[PDB]
Amino acid sequence: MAIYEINGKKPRIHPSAFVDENAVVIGDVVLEEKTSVWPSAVLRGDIEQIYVGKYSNVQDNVSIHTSHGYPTEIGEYVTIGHNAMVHGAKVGNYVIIGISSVILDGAKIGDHVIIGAGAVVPPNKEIPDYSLVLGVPGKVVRQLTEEEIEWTKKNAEIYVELAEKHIKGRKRI
Amino acid sequence: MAIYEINGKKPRIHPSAFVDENAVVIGDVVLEEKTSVWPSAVLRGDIEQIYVGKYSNVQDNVSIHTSHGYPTEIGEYVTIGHNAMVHGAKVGNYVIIGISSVILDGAKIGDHVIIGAGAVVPPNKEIPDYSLVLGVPGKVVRQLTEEEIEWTKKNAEIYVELAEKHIKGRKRI
Amino acid sequence: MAIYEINGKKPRIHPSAFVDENAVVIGDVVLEEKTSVWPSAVLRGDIEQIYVGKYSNVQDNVSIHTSHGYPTEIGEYVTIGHNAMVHGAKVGNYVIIGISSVILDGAKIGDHVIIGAGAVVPPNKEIPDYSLVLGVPGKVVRQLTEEEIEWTKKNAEIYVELAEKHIKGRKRI
Ligand SMILES: [Ca+2]
Ligand SMILES: [Ca+2]
Ligand SMILES: [Ca+2]
Ligand SMILES: [Ca+2]
Ligand SMILES: [Ca+2]
Ligand SMILES: [Ca+2]
Ligand SMILES: [Ca+2]
Ligand SMILES: [Ca+2]
Ligand SMILES: [Cl-]
Ligand SMILES: [Cl-]
Ligand SMILES: [Cl-]
Ligand SMILES: [Zn+2]
Ligand SMILES: [Zn+2]
Ligand SMILES: [Zn+2]
């Protein structure tokens, strides 16, 4: 994307990662292998670090930030849905963060979790593995089905391929 | 906006359309006559096509995407509110998509419909004509009034004029 | 940010304000001393004026707009959270607009108010001072605590310092 350093920090971006030139990555941000950051997404690492694990995607118009003492750590095969916002939270592996949802400071999202579109996970809220979270404040309404569990990985894999397609075939006109 | 092709697809944009240079239009996207795409809006046509009918506007920080087998088709005189997100859905004519609302895959929004701000239309949800939709999950709470019906067109017309004003009078400083 | 005039209006920006180059400021917009506009934020002053008072911040992916007869006026020490949207509303001093929340036309937000993440303040809704607002439609659920009241200022002060850090230490790479 448009990539920036701020005072002593430069983003650490794996060569295989896709960062749309219209995305904004600033400071203390780590993007691992096969990650992807889409148009208009903002990863502002000007306070605590923002870490994005392997095979994870940060979709269009998403914002990721932190609070003092609350870094944002994202696991592997994580899908951060369009227009969602993650703030100073810990997100496990195989997690689908719903479109336009919000994850607040201190929250701990387990593995194989789906956060519904528009849901808001309150500060310090701990979400167990295999949970479906809906509402504002977000509640665990039930456990995921086998189909949804397979989807928590599939969604991310689709993006890994999409990222490569953009890396190789995008052309500004 | 910042316009891009991806592998064999180039956006088809009508000469009268306004696409803010800060918007992002990629791939298989069709923008008809008198449409407008505002700052920070993202129309990513990298899977299925995104079609935007005549006199329709896609406001600031909006994201439009699709899923395999689920293209996004927008009708005429449609207002896609600031920060809203439309994903693989069919939207009819004279529809006001509320600010920061979400329309999910397979949804079919009828004509002369108003989706409230922050509402979430679930996947495959069918919304009848003349409906007011509120909530998460979005429910049809009542039919529109005559004033609201006239507004479903007026809102779009205001934007058609606004688009022309920007086309002719915008200047970067 | 990317700054623009539209027909006779040029933004009035105080020398001390920070406007990220990835933000979009258009037309009739006033940004006072020590204000800050972050990446992907959009302040579109193409209808009525958008005024942002001293020490206030407009975070990443936020959109601010107006309606005919409804300008947007923001007071001092106001924090407009990531991905929030303010439309033709009046916001007082020491107000925290929650992440991904929505403030609609004609709304009047009092001083020392916290709007919860994802909440939607309905058109013409008046929120009294020292209120905590939650829900859709947004309701005053209780008065703020002393800690929250001190936070309504602290949040903004953190940003004033952050803005200066970016003004002096940002570097594109
Ligand atoms: Ca390695
Ligand atoms: Ca944006
Ligand atoms: Ca948003
Ligand atoms: Ca390969
Ligand atoms: Ca024609
Ligand atoms: Ca004309
Ligand atoms: Ca002064
Ligand atoms: Ca100083
Ligand atoms: Cl729970
Ligand atoms: Cl219904
Ligand atoms: Cl109330
Ligand atoms: Zn923040
Ligand atoms: Zn998508
Ligand atoms: Zn508007």
Automatic annotation (TrEMBL), chains A, B, C:
CDD domains linked: LbH_FBP
Binding-site residues for Ca(2+) 2, renumbered to this chain: E164
Classification via InterPro entries: Transf_Hexapept/Carb_Anhydrase (IPR050484), Trimer_LpxA-like_sf (IPR011004)
A Pfam short name: DCTN5
GO molecular function: metal ion binding
Residues that hold Ca(2+) 1 according to the record: S40, N61
Residues that coordinate or bind Zn(2+): H65, H82, H87, Y159
Keyword Calcium: yes
UniProt cross-references to SUPFAM superfamilies, sorted A to Z: Trimeric LpxA-like enzymes
Keyword check for Transmembrane helix: no
Annotated keywords: Calcium, Metal-binding, Zinc
Superkingdom as given in the UniProt entry: Archaea
Protein name (Swiss-Prot/TrEMBL): 173aa long hypothetical ferripyochelin binding protein
